[PDB]
């Protein structure tokens, strides 16, 4: 019926404490989604080109050239932390939980409303909105994951984080195949390097369509759609950070002489000369046993080529790295490769009363200390004569290939059988929750964007489209675009995301770091006088844990 | 006639490979456009050898690496191979799927 | 901005300037979000000597 509501708005986070210290967390999110009709009812194949930018020698890092199928449909993506948890709930979770499991996910659409804009021809323009009770909203649910997976948080296009603000969906578009060549150059590179877009190789063409691969439900003003509960199987996400590096693994050396009076200069002394110490070292030609040369069980962290660009059929891409930098915690402005930087708009955290289109930005300096500090590690000759000379060492200050600004660490990879690393920490509120595992026979060990990875499947993507509202002059034989009555839709989206977490237990004398309100961040969690809201980034691994 | 074997190179249809002339390295500062001192192009020599560039000694295999199994080759391709006796075993074999 | 007429030179344009775009990148010291610097889930393929 038109006058009977088909659902209830619900945005309450529930905690239900189970046996053995586990907590059943239910995050109900509810939004009002506004949807305009598509620009055109037809699928487009658009080749986006920015050769003007890359035509300038040395700008190869600014390539946006690609090919995309632009579709008339719109994607309703809720794969972002902010959509589910308000700052207080996240504070509770990070301060008192230790591990997080993704349990279930369900979503539904109700109170579908379709309206048409009749723009009067009156000399002073005016427009009246009318309820078209017969219009239909097409809802498609890719339950079988037939369509390409296109997470929205990567582009900051998920639903809004404010329950009391209407949100808009994102027009769905998926990459089409293409070939590209961008020979790197630098300021001073003579001529124009080879920069060509070869087009689409026929063997790799895929042209998906929702109308052909997904059943489509037509919802009038009195209808509702529910996706049913989806159950995850993702690995647990740890809410604790590791501080121990190789230098802090195992039994420390025995201090034969200990300080006698408190002070900043009263250090402990091992006493025994370095060459006469007792231990085990992987270096078989030196008797010097040191805190640096001692044998650790394995390697915590791996050095990777940083700011290295790799070319493939589609052009250049930046090599990802799964660890943060060392010493970047001192200042966010001193961040470097590996620290994820998020840019977001007024829907996703930026002060809602800000003027201008400049996105709000922040670099997330993770609390885990498993990264690398390239200025430190060096290489020296096998003879290990000490002190080393210029001919027997390769310091980070040394050039490679004659380039004064590029040193050896830029092309150094220490990933090996002994490498150990942690999963990506959650980022609030702009961070993604789950991601799909790759279809490759051999699959990546971890993803750099989401902490939870679907082993089998992720929930089907939800697509919404205002059904065509034809005028009486329609003619399919006309090459011109279809004439449509201006129409839009407002519908309420309600989702339930269920987590399971473990409550932390104190295991040390000293307290641990905790998220708290303070005089500096006070006014970042309350509205301004003109209704301005914001959601600042919050750290998710404040509690430490021992690695070995 | 003759003992010259018949030869062919199997260019697999999968597009998960790399194009060494493309990918490059640049300084962390990421000042743009990059200058000579802040980039290491594939045209740059390593150790003074004009024909050997940095991609020859570059390994990007890491925890995020993903790859596909070897495609079958007909008719001369092998079908099955034995897994190694090593305690830690290779992820895939380059000769049999 | 999408093309209006079919042709080999009618490409689509993103419109927004590179430095003012919205997204996530693993590079924490650049505001330039590009089709190359954007963060992908993982790495398909590996360069080897």
């Amino acid at each position: 019926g038109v006058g009977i509501s088909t659902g209830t708005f619900n945005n309450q986070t529930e905690f239900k404490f189970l046996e053995n210290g586990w907590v059943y967390i239910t995050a109900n999110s509810s939004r009002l989604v506004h949807l305009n009709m598509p620009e055109s009812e037809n699928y487009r194949r658009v080749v986006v080109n920015n050769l003007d930018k890359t035509a300038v020698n040395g700008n190869m890092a600014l390539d946006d050239t690609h090919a995309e199928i632009v579709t008339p449909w719109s994607l309703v993506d809720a794969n972002a932390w902010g959509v589910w948890f308000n700052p207080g709930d996240w504070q509770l979770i990070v301060n008192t939980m230790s591990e997080l499991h993704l349990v279930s996910f369900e979503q539904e659409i109700f109170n579908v409303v379709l309206k048409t804009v009749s723009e009067s021809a009156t000399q002073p323009p005016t427009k009246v909105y009318n309820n078209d009770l017969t219009a239909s909203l097409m809802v498609a649910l890719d339950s079988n994951n037939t369509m390409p997976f296109t997470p929205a948080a990567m582009r900051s296009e998920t639903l809004g984080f404010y329950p009391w603000k209407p949100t808009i969906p994102t027009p769905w578009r998926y990459y089409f195949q293409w070939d590209r060549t961008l020979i790197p150059s630098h300021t001073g590179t003579s001529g124009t390097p080879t920069n060509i877009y070869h087009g689409t190789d026929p063997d790799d063409v895929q042209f998906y369509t929702i109308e052909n691969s997904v059943p489509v439900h037509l919802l009038r003003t009195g209808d509702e759609f529910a996706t049913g509960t989806f159950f995850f199987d993702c690995k647990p996400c740890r809410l604790t950070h590791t501080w121990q590096t190789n230098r802090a693994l195992g039994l420390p050396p025995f201090l034969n002489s200990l300080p006698q009076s408190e002070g900043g200069t009263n250090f402990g002394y091992i006493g025994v000369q370095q060459d006469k110490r007792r231990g085990v070292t992987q270096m078989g030609n030196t008797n010097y046993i040191t805190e640096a040369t001692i044998m650790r069980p394995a390697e915590v962290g791996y050095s990777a080529p940083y700011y290295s660009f790799e070319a493939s059929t589609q052009g250049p891409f930046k090599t990802p790295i799964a660890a943060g930098r060392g010493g970047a915690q001192t200042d966010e402005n001193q961040a470097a490769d590996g620290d994820p930087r998020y840019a977001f708009g007024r829907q996703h955290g930026q002060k809602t009363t800000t003027t201008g289109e400049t996105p709000e930005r922040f670099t997330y300096i993770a609390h885990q200390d498993t990264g690398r500090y390239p200025e430190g590690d060096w290489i020296q000759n096998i003879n290990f004569n000490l002190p080393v000379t210029d001919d027997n060492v390769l310091l980070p200050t040394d050039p490679i290939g004659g380039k004064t600004g590029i040193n050896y660490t830029n092309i150094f990879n220490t990933y090996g059988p002994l490498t150990a690393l942690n999963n990506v920490p959650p980022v609030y509120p702009n961070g993604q929750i789950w991601d799909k595992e790759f279809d490759t026979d051999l699959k990546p060990r971890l993803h750099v964007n989401a902490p939870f990875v679907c082993q089998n499947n992720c929930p089907g993507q939800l697509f919404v489209k205002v059904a065509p509202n034809l005028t009486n002059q329609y003619d399919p034989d006309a090459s011109a675009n279809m004439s449509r009555i201006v129409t839009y839709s407002d519908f309420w989206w309600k989702g339930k995301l269920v987590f399971k977490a473990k409550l932390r237990a104190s295991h040390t004398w000293n307290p641990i770091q905790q998220m708290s309100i303070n005089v500096d961040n006070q006014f970042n969690y309350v509205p301004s006088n003109i209704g301005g809201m914001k959601i600042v980034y919050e750290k998710s691994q404040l509690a430490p844990r021992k690695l070995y | 006639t003759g003992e010259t074997p018949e030869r062919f190179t199997y260019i697999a249809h999968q597009d998960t490979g790399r194009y060494p002339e493309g990918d490059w390295i640049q300084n962390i500062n990421f000042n743009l456009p990059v200058t000579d001192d802040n980039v290491l192009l594939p045209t740059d020599p390593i150790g003074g050898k004009t024909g050997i560039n940095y991609t020859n000694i570059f390994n990007t295999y890491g925890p995020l690496t993903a790859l596909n199994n070897v495609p079958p080759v007909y008719p001369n391709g092998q079908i099955w191979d034995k897994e190694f006796d090593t305690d830690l075993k290779p992820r895939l074999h380059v000769n049999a799927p | 901005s999408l093309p209006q007429s079919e042709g080999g030179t009618n490409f689509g344009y993103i419109g927004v300037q590179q430095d003012k775009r919205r997204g996530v990148t693993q590079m924490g010291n650049t505001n330039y979000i590009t089709e190359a610097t954007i963060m992908r889930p993982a790495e398909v393929g590996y360069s080897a000597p």
Partner: antibody
Amino acid sequence: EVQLVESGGDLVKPGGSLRLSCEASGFTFSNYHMAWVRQAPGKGLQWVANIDSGGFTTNYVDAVRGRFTVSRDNGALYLQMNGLRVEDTAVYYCATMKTTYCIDENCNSFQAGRGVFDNWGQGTLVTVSS
Amino acid sequence: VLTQKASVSGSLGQTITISCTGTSSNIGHNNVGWYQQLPGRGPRTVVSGTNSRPSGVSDRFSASKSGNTATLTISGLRADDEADYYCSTWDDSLNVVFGGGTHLTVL
């Protein structure tokens, strides 16, 4: 249709300064590299300067190098002229430099390039004398 | 400066050719563009490489490039073709280089 309109041409004294403008409409002005090209009375075309699509780099000819400057504001082009000399008297035009060239008739594949100007403005006359 | 012929002349309906020349190190690797210049008008792009014409340009124009030389062919002269023709390109010294022009004329 693409529209480029120049303005600012006027009589000026030698050794002074001036500002010429090139307003653009009907196309994505920010997606195209731009160029200032001058022609003296009855003489051939002479390249004055050029600027990229983001202002990262600008290039000049030796005659105006160190004297003039070029800038853009996403809506129009500007040429700042300093140290004007008698020979500078000429008509100036703003043209889009074709940054892409398709290599097939339907032009499914395209390549980067330089040295071809696609669209031109109307042009403006600058006279420097007493 | 690229080399060009000062002028040419021909009868109506004749298919004619004009040439621009320069060092292959600059005219070779870079593209070449041909523009028309009528009295009381700014240069109009007639040929933009790959034998492709801008919209609104008569199909009579054609162009080709070979090493040091670039050739522009007109398939049948018309009274409105009496005008200056200008070749331009990019130069590996990071310049934009034009020719001296050629005043096409009709007998």
